[PDB]
Design a protein around this motif. Structure first.
Motif, PDB file in Angstrom:
ATOM      1  N   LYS A  89       1.099   1.266   2.779  1.00  0.00           N
ATOM      2  CA  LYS A  89       1.580   1.452   4.201  1.00  0.00           C
ATOM      3  C   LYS A  89       2.591   2.460   4.093  1.00  0.00           C
ATOM      4  O   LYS A  89       3.183   3.442   4.780  1.00  0.00           O
ATOM      5  CB  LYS A  89       1.161   0.495   5.095  1.00  0.00           C
ATOM      6  CG  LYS A  89       0.660   0.036   5.195  1.00  0.00           C
ATOM      7  CD  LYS A  89       0.691  -1.338   5.556  1.00  0.00           C
ATOM      8  CE  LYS A  89       1.533  -2.717   5.417  1.00  0.00           C
ATOM      9  NZ  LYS A  89       1.120  -3.132   3.861  1.00  0.00           N
ATOM     10  N   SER A  90       3.830   2.034   3.533  1.00  0.00           N
ATOM     11  CA  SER A  90       4.669   2.724   3.417  1.00  0.00           C
ATOM     12  C   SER A  90       4.913   4.052   2.867  1.00  0.00           C
ATOM     13  O   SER A  90       5.668   4.816   2.915  1.00  0.00           O
ATOM     14  CB  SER A  90       6.435   1.361   2.475  1.00  0.00           C
ATOM     15  OG  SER A  90       6.015   0.194   3.228  1.00  0.00           O
ATOM     16  N   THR A  91       3.664   4.217   1.572  1.00  0.00           N
ATOM     17  CA  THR A  91       3.197   5.840   1.473  1.00  0.00           C
ATOM     18  C   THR A  91       3.056   7.034   1.593  1.00  0.00           C
ATOM     19  O   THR A  91       3.151   7.327   2.354  1.00  0.00           O
ATOM     20  CB  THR A  91       2.569   5.363   0.361  1.00  0.00           C
ATOM     21  OG1 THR A  91       2.671   4.760  -0.600  1.00  0.00           O
ATOM     22  CG2 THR A  91       2.220   7.425  -0.196  1.00  0.00           C
ATOM     23  N   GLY A 134      13.417   1.329   7.639  1.00  0.00           N
ATOM     24  CA  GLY A 134      12.533   1.249   6.575  1.00  0.00           C
ATOM     25  C   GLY A 134      12.527  -0.412   5.965  1.00  0.00           C
ATOM     26  O   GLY A 134      13.406  -1.436   6.393  1.00  0.00           O
ATOM     27  N   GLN A 135      11.703  -0.113   5.195  1.00  0.00           N
ATOM     28  CA  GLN A 135      11.778  -1.739   4.434  1.00  0.00           C
ATOM     29  C   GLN A 135      13.104  -2.666   3.520  1.00  0.00           C
ATOM     30  O   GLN A 135      13.242  -0.987   2.460  1.00  0.00           O
ATOM     31  CB  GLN A 135      10.341  -1.778   3.445  1.00  0.00           C
ATOM     32  CG  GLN A 135       9.827  -3.206   3.160  1.00  0.00           C
ATOM     33  CD  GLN A 135       8.754  -3.902   2.965  1.00  0.00           C
ATOM     34  OE1 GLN A 135       7.747  -2.058   2.473  1.00  0.00           O
ATOM     35  NE2 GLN A 135       8.087  -5.009   3.050  1.00  0.00           N
ATOM     36  N   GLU A 136      13.400  -3.002   4.115  1.00  0.00           N
ATOM     37  CA  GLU A 136      14.519  -3.568   3.552  1.00  0.00           C
ATOM     38  C   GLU A 136      16.089  -2.461   4.138  1.00  0.00           C
ATOM     39  O   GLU A 136      16.342  -1.963   3.155  1.00  0.00           O
ATOM     40  CB  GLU A 136      13.856  -4.164   1.882  1.00  0.00           C
ATOM     41  CG  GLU A 136      13.583  -5.957   1.774  1.00  0.00           C
ATOM     42  CD  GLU A 136      13.206  -5.350   0.906  1.00  0.00           C
ATOM     43  OE1 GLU A 136      12.196  -6.620   0.671  1.00  0.00           O
ATOM     44  OE2 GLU A 136      13.540  -4.694  -0.458  1.00  0.00           O
ATOM     45  N   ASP A 168       8.876   0.010   9.831  1.00  0.00           N
ATOM     46  CA  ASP A 168       8.378   0.161   9.167  1.00  0.00           C
ATOM     47  C   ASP A 168       9.222  -1.559   8.496  1.00  0.00           C
ATOM     48  O   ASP A 168       9.774  -1.754   7.782  1.00  0.00           O
ATOM     49  CB  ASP A 168       8.880   0.329   8.042  1.00  0.00           C
ATOM     50  CG  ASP A 168       7.948   0.704   6.296  1.00  0.00           C
ATOM     51  OD1 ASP A 168       6.589  -0.544   6.411  1.00  0.00           O
ATOM     52  OD2 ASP A 168       7.653   1.103   5.160  1.00  0.00           O
ATOM     53  N   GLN A 169       8.168  -2.463   9.351  1.00  0.00           N
ATOM     54  CA  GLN A 169       8.148  -4.218   9.204  1.00  0.00           C
ATOM     55  C   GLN A 169       9.271  -3.925   9.659  1.00  0.00           C
ATOM     56  O   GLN A 169      10.632  -4.964   9.127  1.00  0.00           O
ATOM     57  CB  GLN A 169       7.676  -3.965   8.075  1.00  0.00           C
ATOM     58  CG  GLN A 169       6.737  -4.480   7.393  1.00  0.00           C
ATOM     59  CD  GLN A 169       5.701  -5.432   6.041  1.00  0.00           C
ATOM     60  OE1 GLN A 169       6.536  -5.930   5.907  1.00  0.00           O
ATOM     61  NE2 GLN A 169       5.305  -4.220   5.224  1.00  0.00           N
ATOM     62  N   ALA A 170       9.818  -3.591  10.492  1.00  0.00           N
ATOM     63  CA  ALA A 170      11.866  -4.039  11.324  1.00  0.00           C
ATOM     64  C   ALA A 170      11.947  -5.360  11.938  1.00  0.00           C
ATOM     65  O   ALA A 170      13.228  -5.344  11.714  1.00  0.00           O
ATOM     66  CB  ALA A 170      11.305  -3.013  12.654  1.00  0.00           C
TER      67      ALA A 170
HETATM   68 MG   LIG Z   1       6.190  -1.437   2.179  1.00  0.00          MG
END
Ligand SMILES: [Mg+2]
Ligand SMILES: Nc1ncnc2c1ncn2[C@@H]1O[C@H](COP(=O)(O)OP(=O)(O)OP(=O)(O)O)[C@@H](O)[C@H]1O
Ligand SMILES: Nc1ncnc2c1ncn2[C@@H]1O[C@H](COP(=O)(O)OP(=O)(O)OP(=O)(O)O)[C@@H](O)[C@H]1O
Ligand SMILES: [Mg+2]
Lengths: 564, 550, 29
Positions: free
Chosen positions: B377-379, B418-420, B499-501
């Protein structure tokens, strides 16, 4: 005063420096005695030629040996200094690293020490060699004429008077130079460590401008440095010339008075021309010594600083229960010592029981987790582990008995095996590592990698997804078999399948009877089976009890749960 | 090889020409002045030897001091100018190297370590800085005096001067071997120093984890074991240098002996007089020393520039990126299409991550992408932001390839959380308005209120002017995530990627933020694991093992 | 005896001069 602090580092090698000095003196005397043994070279044939051949070869070999010994000793000195500086840096308290950024510390440790060591290495050898030559010439000059030697020696302090006045300015300049270099290094490190974000916001130009500003400050200082160099060179050369001229003129008055023959004066002058060069070199050395004093201020401040954290204790009991008691704990971060993050916490962790800590964002849960790991000391009340305060246990034993999974955990740039087994003295076998990976659920994808547990990981763990990093951190915490386990949002990035592993670990694994577990999460459905639920808001515990009791009270917990 | 690098350094030093010309002028004046002091020294020592005649003594002494004064002034000016030139060259090198590093593709930053790059920026540019202002100055000063000494020698005995060219005080074979080994050992030293610096980078960067595991002593032992190798390399360099200098000393002695023998032969046959022989021997000693000095300086000058080749390699590397785009339309609808996209990361190209995805995002709708860990997913999010190029298929934004839009324009319309998330050191305002040339405070406050960030900003020491510390470490996780959301909302993007915010946000705050597309004008992509938030979506995409499921 | 040899004298002068070339080349700039 700081010069003695600089020279103190040579106290571990005095024998080798003494041998080097002996060799230098012997070579100087061997080179000096040639004219007395071979004449004018106009009196010349074979014997006088072979004599100076042998003497030249002997002097060259002696110089080679002396240089070898000196260069061997200086490397040991340099490496020892760098190692001790790094060791002293790592002993400081936690907030020291909040006050000093990573780039500044790295520049101080790696760059200042190298410059100090190199300057010391060159200057000490140069000073010793020219001092020996100067004394060897002074002996002959004194033999030539006592009166002129005395009237030369009387005027020497006046030449050193001027450099002593402007010494402090070199230190005050070098401090700023090193500080600006460290500030630029920090910007470089911070920009390079987060390239995906900078690219995502198209902010390369801003980072370049930030770097350019520090470079401009350094450019500003360098002009003053160069002007000072030029002026100092002028003054040194003028002092040398006047020192020659005065004594030369005095010799004329002596010969005209008919007191001393010209024969003595010719030799005395011919050796004064070299003694003056020696003392001029010794004059040139001093400003560089002041510069080196200026360059070493911050690393010596690191070395001589006393940590504000308490030292490690001595207790290492064989069997530890894992009972944790908080007694009226209050805390305030050192940079804002007037804001109480935590106010009067009182609760207990007991083996075999899971305690859940819940609350809104910014309420202080991770502060409690950090206090439990002895990263900070409470400002009020007591925190007891099995009846003893935390500092009384040994540093390595305590963090082997207490393990935590941090919020947004970090992973180092090593192999997965060394990441899982990080921090252990007795290296575990592959079976223990495999079992720990299986418990956390990381085995299912580690085994799919081409090199298995030997796979390398980048310095930030970029080659792993978030859930994979969390699983690796969980295995890293599990491998030690701790008595108190701290989970800090360990399921934020884990999918539904992996959360089952955490549930089995918490409530069904047969090893749960030996641990005390502190569970911090915003995933409320995970804490429904907890033995105690503590609601933390504003730094104080509002309510507590089992899930049924908190549901019945219809308080803050019920309001939080019922909202969706 | 080293000639090309030397020519590059010469090309770089053009902005310092008006200072270098004055430096060389002062060098010429000083070298002229230095030659005339011994003449008057001799013209004074003999006045002391002979009849006094105070007037002649004083007249000689006054000229002596005058010329010494002039030479001293020239030397001081030369030194100052060359020092300033060196500093300027160093700063220029650092600035160019950093500006070139910022251009590289994201794959470059995984093949290298940050500490190694920083140890290339520091302590490596100094060797490139020392080339012109230090080595060439002394080389020219030695050459211009060697030629003068030979000119003086030519007047005494041309036959002896011709004999003086016998093999020179040095052997060319030894110089070649020493110059071959010295460059190699210097390169090894630089690599070892960079490896040593990386350890400090890792240990200081993540200190809280090391504290939590109590592994400070392990890191100290690693650092000392890394320092040991650098110590050994330093010793290896120094011992060889000393041995080579000893060999050259022996060679000089031998040449001196042969020359004295030939001079004695010229004496025995009556072809020479003693004063001329003495003067010739003095000049010969000077020449024999100076030639060796010149050769050594030239060798060292070449060796340092040769050893510093890594910086030149970094400065010249062509990024593995497509040609820069030019499109920047006044209006953008926000339609995104994936067409048979296949991708595999450059550092591991043998393992595919995406296996032919295809989908479409449209304005006014919320699209959700779900899947297990490691599913890519992050890709997908990174590919949508043009951080990586697809190995197959195309990514289209309003029917144009994503890489044809201008770099500054594209990242103002397509913004992601972004994630983290990561924050930079500085004030809260500079983190919210990150990447913007000009931003009003009203927009910053509106963005802060849009992400529910005001209620904790007001409690800081200076409000929006409070420093957040390195990596945002002086904040709670939820506060950092809210600031990251505000940083994206301040730009008014056409396409927004989450992205999973809401991973770290509490239950209450997550409810108050599901209105991502209240105005119905954005294109929103939501990446999540929680099945609660996907209920608001109009299109749901399930990603498994790199392929979209039905 | 007491007397100075010019050749050895300059040898000493050159030895005092060239110590700064092979070591501490920075000082000569
Ligand atoms: Mg990810
Ligand atoms: N290093 C620090 N120095 C000063 N104040 C800090 C520091 N770290 C955190 N704080 C502040 O102290 C309080 C403690 O927040 P903390 O990180 O404990 O929250 P939390 O409950 O873990 O939050 P979250 O649920 O978002 O993870 C917050 O107001 C935070 O902004
Ligand atoms: N820089 C990289 N180089 C090589 N492989 C990578 C890199 N980053 C990620 N991967 C791999 O590519 C795959 C996709 O990972 P990705 O980060 O896209 O997952 P994700 O869906 O975002 O996961 P999660 O739900 O854990 O956040 C994984 O197998 C991961 O290990
Ligand atoms: Mg937290």
């Amino acid at each position: 005063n700081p010069v003695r602090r600089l020279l103190g580092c040579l106290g571990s090698e005095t024998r080798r420096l003494s041998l080097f000095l002996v060799l230098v003196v012997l070579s100087s005397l061997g080179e000096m005695a040639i004219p007395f043994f071979t004449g004018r070279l106009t009196d010349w044939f074979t014997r006088n030629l072979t004599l100076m051949s042998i003497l030249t070869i002997a002097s060259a070999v002696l110089e080679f040996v002396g240089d070898g010994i000196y260069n061997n000793t200086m490397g040991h000195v340099h490496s020892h200094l760098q190692g001790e500086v790094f060791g002293a840096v790592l002993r400081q308290e936690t907030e020291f690293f909040q006050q000093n950024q990573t780039g500044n510390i790295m520049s101080r440790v790696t760059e200042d020490t190298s410059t100090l060591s190199d300057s010391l290495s060159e200057n000490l050898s140069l000073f010793l060699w020219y001092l020996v030559r100067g004394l060897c010439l002074l002996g002959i000059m004194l033999w030539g004429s006592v009166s002129l030697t005395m009237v030369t020696l009387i005027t020497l302090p006046l030449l050193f008077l001027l450099p002593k006045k402007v010494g402090k300015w070199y230190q005050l300049l070098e401090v700023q130079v090193r500080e600006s270099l460290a500030k630029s290094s920090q910007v470089a490190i911070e920009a390079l460590s987060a390239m995906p974000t900078v690219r995502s916001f198209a902010n390369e130009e801003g980072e370049a401008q930030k770097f350019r500003e520090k470079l401009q400050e350094i450019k500003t200082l360098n002009q003053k440095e160069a002007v000072a160099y030029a002026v100092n060179s002028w003054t040194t050369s003028i002092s040398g010339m006047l020192l020659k001229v005065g004594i030369l003129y005095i010799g004329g008055q002596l010969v005209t008075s008919g007191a001393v023959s010209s024969g003595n004066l010719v030799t005395f002058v011919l050796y004064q021309m070299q003694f003056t060069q020696a003392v001029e070199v010794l004059l040139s050395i001093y400003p560089r010594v002041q510069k080196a004093v200026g360059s070493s201020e911050k690393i010596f401040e690191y070395l001589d600083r006393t940590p504000r954290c308490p030292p490690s204790g001595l207790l290492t009991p064989l069997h530890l229960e894992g009972l944790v008691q908080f007694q009226d704990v209050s805390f305030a971060y050192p940079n804002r010592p007037d804001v109480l993050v935590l106010q009067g916490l009182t609760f207990t962790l007991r083996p075999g029981e899971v305690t859940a800590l819940v609350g809104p964002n910014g309420s202080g849960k991770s502060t409690v987790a950090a206090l439990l790991q002895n990263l900070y000391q409470p400002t009020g009340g007591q925190l007891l582990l099995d009846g003893k305060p935390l500092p009384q246990y040994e540093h390595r034993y305590l963090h082997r008995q207490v393990a935590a999974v941090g919020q947004e955990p970090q992973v180092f740039g090593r192999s997965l095996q060394e990441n899982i087994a990080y921090g252990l003295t007795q290296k575990p076998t592959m079976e223990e590592i495999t079992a720990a990976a299986v418990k956390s659920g990381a085995h299912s994808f580690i085994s799919g990698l081409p090199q298995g547990y030997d796979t390398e990981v980048d310095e930030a763990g970029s080659q792993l997804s978030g859930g994979q990093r969390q699983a690796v951190a969980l295995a890293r915490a599990l491998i030690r078999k701790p008595c108190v386990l701290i989970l800090d949002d360990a399921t934020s990035a884990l999918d539904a399948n992996s959360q089952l592993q955490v549930e089995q670990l918490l409530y069904e694994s047969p090893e749960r009877y030996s641990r005390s577990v502190l569970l911090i999460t915003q995933h409320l459905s995970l804490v429904e089976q907890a033995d105690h639920i503590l609601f933390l808001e504003g730094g104080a515990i509002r309510e507590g009890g089992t899930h049924q009791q908190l549901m019945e009270k219809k308080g803050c917990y019920w309001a939080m749960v019922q909202a969706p | 090889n080293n000639k090309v690098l030397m020519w590059r350094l010469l090309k770089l030093s053009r902005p310092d020409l008006p200072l270098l010309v004055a430096a060389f002028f002062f060098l010429v004046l000083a070298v002229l002045g230095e030659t005339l002091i011994p003449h008057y020294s001799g013209r004074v020592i003999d006045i002391l030897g002979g009849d006094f005649d105070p007037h002649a003594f004083a007249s000689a002494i006054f000229f002596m001091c005058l010329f010494s004064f002039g030479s001293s002034l020239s030397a001081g000016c030369r030194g100052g100018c060359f020092t300033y030139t060196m500093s300027r060259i160093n700063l220029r090198i650092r600035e160019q190297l950093f500006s070139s590093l910022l251009r590289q593709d994201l794959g470059f930053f995984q093949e290298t370590k940050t500490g190694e790059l920083n140890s290339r920026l520091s302590s490596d540019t100094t060797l490139m800085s020392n080339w012109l202002p230090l080595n060439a100055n002394v080389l020219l000063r030695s050459l211009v005096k060697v030629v003068g000494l030979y000119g003086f020698m030519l007047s005494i005995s041309p036959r002896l001067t011709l004999l003086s060219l016998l093999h020179m005080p040095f052997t060319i074979a030894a110089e070649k071997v020493y110059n071959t080994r010295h460059q190699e050992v210097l390169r090894e030293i630089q690599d070892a120093v960079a490896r040593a610096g990386q350890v400090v980078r890792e240990a200081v960067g993540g200190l809280q984890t090391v504290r939590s595991f109590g592994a400070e002593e392990h890191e100290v032992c690693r650092y000392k074991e890394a320092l040991e190798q650098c110590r050994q390399l330093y010793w290896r360099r120094d011992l060889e240098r000393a041995l080579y200098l000893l060999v050259r000393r022996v060679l000089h002695l031998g040449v001196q002996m042969l020359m004295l023998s030939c001079g004695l032969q010229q004496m025995q046959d009556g072809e020479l007089t003693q004063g001329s022989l003495l003067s010739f021997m003095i000049y010969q000693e000077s020449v024999g020393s100076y030639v060796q000095t010149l050769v050594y300086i030239y060798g060292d000058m070449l060796s340092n520039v040769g050893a510093a080749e890594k910086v030149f390699s970094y400065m010249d590397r062509q990024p593995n990126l497509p040609s820069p785009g030019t499109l920047a339309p006044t209006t953008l609808q926000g339609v995104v299409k994936f067409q048979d996209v296949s991708f595999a990361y450059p550092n591991r190209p043998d393992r595919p991550v995406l296996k032919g995805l295809t989908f479409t995002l449209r304005p006014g709708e919320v699209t959700a992408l779900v899947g297990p860990n490691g599913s890519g997913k992050s890709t997908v999010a990174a590919l949508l932001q043009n951080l990586y190029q697809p190995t197959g298929g195309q990514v289209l934004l309003d029917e144009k390839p994503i890489s044809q839009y201008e770099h500054c324009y594209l990242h103002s319309q397509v913004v992601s959380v972004g994630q983290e998330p990561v924050l930079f050191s500085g004030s809260v305002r500079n983190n919210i308005a990150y990447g913007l040339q000009s931003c009003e405070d009203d927009k910053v406050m509106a963005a802060a209120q849009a992400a529910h960030a005001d209620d904790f900003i007001q409690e800081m020491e200076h409000g929006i002017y409070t420093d957040v510390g390195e990596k945002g470490s002086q904040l709670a996780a939820g506060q950092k995530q809210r600031l990251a959301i505000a940083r994206a909302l301040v730009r008014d993007p056409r396409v927004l990627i989450l992205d999973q915010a809401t991973s770290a946000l509490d239950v209450q705050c997550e409810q108050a933020l599901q209105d991502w597309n209240s105005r119905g004008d954005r294109t929103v992509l939501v990446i999540a694991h929680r099945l609660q938030t996907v209920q608001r979506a109009h299109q749901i995409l399930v990603l498994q093992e790199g392929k979209l499921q039905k | 005896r007491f007397k100075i040899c010019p050749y050895h004298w300059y040898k000493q002068h050159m030895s005092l001069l060239f110590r700064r070339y092979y070591h501490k080349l920075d000082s000569i700039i």
